[PDB]
């Protein structure tokens, strides 16, 4: 499964 | 910007035999950016029923794709893959060769 947390904008 | 040229391999899935429903592949890799034009050819003429894989990339960030079509070899008919990309001034045609 994909990460639900920690994919933030740069 | 870094523009990397595509490497091309053209090959069949299973070993080449006249009369058997094989698949012709054109594997392109090592290129950036992701926009690319790939044609599989039967006797110089562009094949219509051509599928390709979902775009992915290697650790160095370079992209790869597999094009393929269901096909059937002959002694007469000849095959090839035709590739255009930004790094290419003329389209690269790589002939299929049942021994490679």
């Amino acid at each position: 499964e994909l990460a639900g947390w920690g994919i933030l904008t740069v | 910007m870094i523009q990397r040229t595509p490497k091309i391999q053209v090959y069949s899935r299973h070993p080449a035999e006249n009369g058997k429903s094989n698949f012709l592949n054109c594997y392109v890799s090592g290129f950036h950016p992701s926009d690319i034009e790939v044609d599989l050819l039967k006797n110089g003429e562009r094949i219509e029923k051509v599928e390709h894989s979902d775009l992915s990339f290697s650790k160095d960030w370079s992209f790869y794709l597999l094009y393929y079509t269901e096909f059937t070899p002959t002694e007469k008919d000849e095959y090839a893959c035709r590739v255009n990309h930004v790094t290419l001034s003329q389209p690269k045609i790589v002939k299929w060769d049942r021994d490679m």
Partner: protein, 275 residues
């Protein structure tokens, strides 16, 4: 042996009208199991391996929810990286993200990954300790400051050491028939005479899974890389891979050369000769 799960994410700006082209794919080992394409009609995360179809409606709703949230993030990023780098509204540009976990033969956390590129160049990556960052340039140092403040590293380390490895273990089990099966290389050798005095021998490996393989020539029992050619490992399209390596030899001396093949699916390495 060991296994891995990785997700790859590519976004490509379309200047003049609308949002970026976004493509996402998930892999267990060398097997693709999921995909999202922003241009497909379904607008849902889609199965690509039969063993993922076992998963139900809520899984698919959640994976769709997250992959769309990834693409928006990427849309914002392409806009922000344009400014960061003083670029025009006219250029097409690319962002790439990769993440995943590796597990050893026991299936226990070995390594985690999270890395990001802009136009094909290192931008920012999570270091192996999963506690800090490699920011390639001053733009990525700014991004780095922002992600330290917002504790991105601690969030990703939990997914990577925890969640990622738990879902891999479940995938491995559910897909066992194929995922835990190795397909040994079908090997054979071919011969071609370039001229009256010079031969080419080609040693083929076919139908193997996983993709990792080693193919080498020996001469009189010693390694020979000179006058040899090796192709990149390539997908057959049915899930397996193919490679060959080839050496050019004097005509008549074909029996001095042997091909050596190493692969997880062979309990011991193979040797081939031209009869």
């Amino acid at each position: 042996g060991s296994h891995s799960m990785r997700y790859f994410f590519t976004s490509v700006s379309r200047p003049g009208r609308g949002e970026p082209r976004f493509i996402a794919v998930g892999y267990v080992d060398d097997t693709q199991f999921v995909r999202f394409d922003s241009d497909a009609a379904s607008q849902r995360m889609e199965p690509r391996a039969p063993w993922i179809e076992q998963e139900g409606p809520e899984y698919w709703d959640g994976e769709t929810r997250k992959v769309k949230a990834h693409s928006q993030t990427h849309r914002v990023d392409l806009g922000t990286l344009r400014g960061y780098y003083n670029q025009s509204e006219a250029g097409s540009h690319t962002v790439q993200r990769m993440y995943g976990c590796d597990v050893g033969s026991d299936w226990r956390f070995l390594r985690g990954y999270h890395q990001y590129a802009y136009d094909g160049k290192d931008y920012i990556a999570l270091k192996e300790d999963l506690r800090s960052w490699t920011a390639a340039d001053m733009a990525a140092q700014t991004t780095k400051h922002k992600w330290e403040a917002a504790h991105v590293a601690e969030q990703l380390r939990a997914y990577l050491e925890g969640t990622c490895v738990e879902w891999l273990r479940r995938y491995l089990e559910n897909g066992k028939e194929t995922l835990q099966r190795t397909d040994a290389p079908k090997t054979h050798m071919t011969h071609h005479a370039v001229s009256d005095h010079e031969a080419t021998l080609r040693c083929w490996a076919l139908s193997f899974y996983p993709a990792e393989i080693t193919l080498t020539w020996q001469r009189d029992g010693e390694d020979q890389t000179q006058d040899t050619e090796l192709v990149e490992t390539r997908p057959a399209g049915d899930g397996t891979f193919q490679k060959w390596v080839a050496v050019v030899v004097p005509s008549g001396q074909e029996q001095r050369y042997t091909c050596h093949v190493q692969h997880e699916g062979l309990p011991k390495p193979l040797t081939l000769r031209w009869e």
